[PDB]
RNA sequence: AUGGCUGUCGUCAGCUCGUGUUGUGAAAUGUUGGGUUAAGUCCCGCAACGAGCGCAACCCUUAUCCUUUGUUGCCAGCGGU
């Protein structure tokens, strides 16, 4: 709400012409983001997220770029919600019947990796199990407790995970995702202009959204 | 006209299916890409996520040792020839 003004961003020298009504002219061969349309649009998204959080809709925090890959996990897991920080598996939302079998394996291997096998088979075989355990856990993480399809999708990056936005679009899942000056503002339910690939910027949204979801919990 | 049983490509490393996505469609992706192996063998990336038949292992023989038994098999230490 025009507090710090630290998400100018500009994301590149060039632009995306579909982002014309959300920019301010910059002489440094870059493109400003107009905060006047940024603040109210963020407020609308927060209000609708509060609206839908009253039914435990399982909001998803999807930030994959290495800048936000930790802050997203913190702001999602450590408070109430799910997340996807590593590579978005192709079709994990629409090929749900096939993806769920992987989470079943993750749960079984987690059960057998605590009081299970330590010497029953070869130590290198247990190492293979641990290797697969880490590979499956880091890629397929917080969504492990998912009951099925979610209700909302909060996507940190804009262009990085177009397959995530399209996967949500195939269903009737609303999408709240911030959009840079070089991204595509179409197909996203709630346009939020702003910079993404910065530490401060992602933390701003991951704090605001986290507080809103916490207060909408009950 | 067939069953069964064989050779061959070739012991070559390939051949496929389910769901998802792409294309009006035939089809494609998975199975491509950077490395490595004898092998789509393995790892990392990745609109793909998994599974099957293959490869490897599971099997017989050979290279060393330990245990059990000592015949029609053996003769190191003891005595007679
Ligand atoms: Mg093919
Ligand atoms: Mg194989």
Give the CA-to-C1' distance from A136 to B7 in angstroms: 48
d(CA A129, CA A14): 47
- The continuous run of DSSP H or E covering A211 comes out as helix A199-216
DSSP, res A178:
E
Q: Which nucleotide is nearest to A170 (CA to C1')?
A: B21
Question: Which technique?
Answer: cryo-EM
Q: Burial, A39: exposed, middle or buried (Cβ in 10 Å; 0-12, 13-18, 19+)? A: middle
Give the CA-to-C1' distance from A121 to B11 in angstroms: 31
Going from the Cα of A33 to the center of ligand 2, the distance in angstroms, rounded, reads 51
Going from the Cα of A125 to the center of ligand 2, the distance in angstroms, rounded, reads 17
d(CA A69, CA A76): 11
How far CA A112 is from CA of A54, A99, A106, A129, A135, in Å, comes to 36, 21, 10, 10, 16
Q: Are A209 and A49 in contact (CB under 8 A)?
A: yes
Q: Which nucleotide is nearest to A167 (CA to C1')?
A: B21
The β-bridge relationship of strands A175-179 and A23-25 is unpaired
d(CA A54, CA A138): 29
Q: Are A83 and A202 in contact (CB under 8 A)?
A: no
User: What is the residue whose two structure tokens read 């870059």?
Assistant: A30
User: What is the residue whose two structure tokens read 């910059």?
Assistant: A26
Going from the Cα of A138 to the center of ligand 1, the distance in angstroms, rounded, reads 30
Q: Are A175 and A189 in contact (CB under 8 A)?
A: yes
Going from the Cα of A20 to the center of ligand 1, the distance in angstroms, rounded, reads 42
Quote the Cα angle for A143-A145-A151, to 5°: 65
Tell me the CA end-to-end span of chain A in Å, nearest whole number: 25
Handedness of CA A78, A82, A83, A89 (dihedral sign): positive
Cβ contacts, strand B, under 7 angstroms: A 87-91, 94-95, 97-99, 101-102, 131, 135-136, 163, 166-167, 170
User: What is the residue whose two structure tokens read 């290797």?
Assistant: A131
Q: Resolution in Å, one decimal, please.
A: 3.1
Half-sphere exposure of A35 (CA within 13 A, CB side): 9
DSSP, res A145:
G
Q: Are A138 and A161 in contact (CB under 8 A)?
A: no
From A174, A186, A217, select the one nearest A79 (Cα to Cα). A217
**Tokens found for residue A174:** 């609303």
Which residues lie below 8 Å from residue A15, measured CB to CB, with a gap of 6+? A23, A31, A181, A182
| DSSP 3-state of A209 | helix
d(CA A102, CA A106): 6
Strand B bases, protein C-beta under 7 A: 18-22, 43-50
User: What is the residue-wise DSSP string for A43-109?
Assistant: HHHHHHHHHHHTT----EEE--STTTTTHHHHHHHTTT-EEE-S---TTTTTSHHHHHHHHHHHHHH
Core vs surface per residue A142-153: b (16+ CB within 10 A) or e: bbeebeeebebb
Going from the Cα of A124 to the center of ligand 2, the distance in angstroms, rounded, reads 19
How far CA A116 is from CA of A108, A119, A129, in Å, comes to 10, 9, 11
A216 Cα distance to chain centroid: 19
d(CA A145, CA A60): 12
């Amino acid at each position: 709400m025009l507090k710090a003004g630290v998400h100018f961003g500009h994301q590149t020298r060039y632009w995306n012409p579909k982002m014309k009504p959300f920019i301010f002219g910059a002489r440094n061969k870059v493109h400003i983001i107009n905060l006047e349309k940024t603040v109210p649009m963020f407020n609308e998204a927060l209000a609708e997220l509060n609206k839908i959080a009253s039914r435990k809709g399982k909001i998803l925090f999807v930030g994959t770029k290495r800048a936000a890959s930790e802050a997203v996990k913190d702001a999602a897991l450590s408070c109430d919600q799910f997340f996807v920080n590593h590579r978005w598996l192709g079709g994990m939302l629409t090929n749900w019947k096939t993806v769920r079998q992987s989470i079943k394996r993750l749960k079984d291997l987690e059960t057998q990796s605590q009081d299970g096998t330590f010497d029953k088979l070869t130590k290198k075989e247990a190492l293979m199990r641990t290797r697969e355990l880490e590979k499956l856990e880091n890629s397929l993480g917080g969504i492990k407790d998912m009951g099925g399809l979610p209700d909302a999708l909060f996507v940190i990056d804009a262009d990085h995970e177009h397959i995530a936005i399209k996967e949500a679009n195939n269903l009737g899942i609303p999408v709240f995702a911030i959009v840079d000056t070089n991204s595509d503002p179409d197909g996203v339910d709630f346009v939020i202009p702003g910079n993404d690939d910065a530490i401060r910027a992602v933390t701003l949204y991951l704090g605001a959204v986290a507080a809103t979801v916490r207060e909408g919990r009950s």
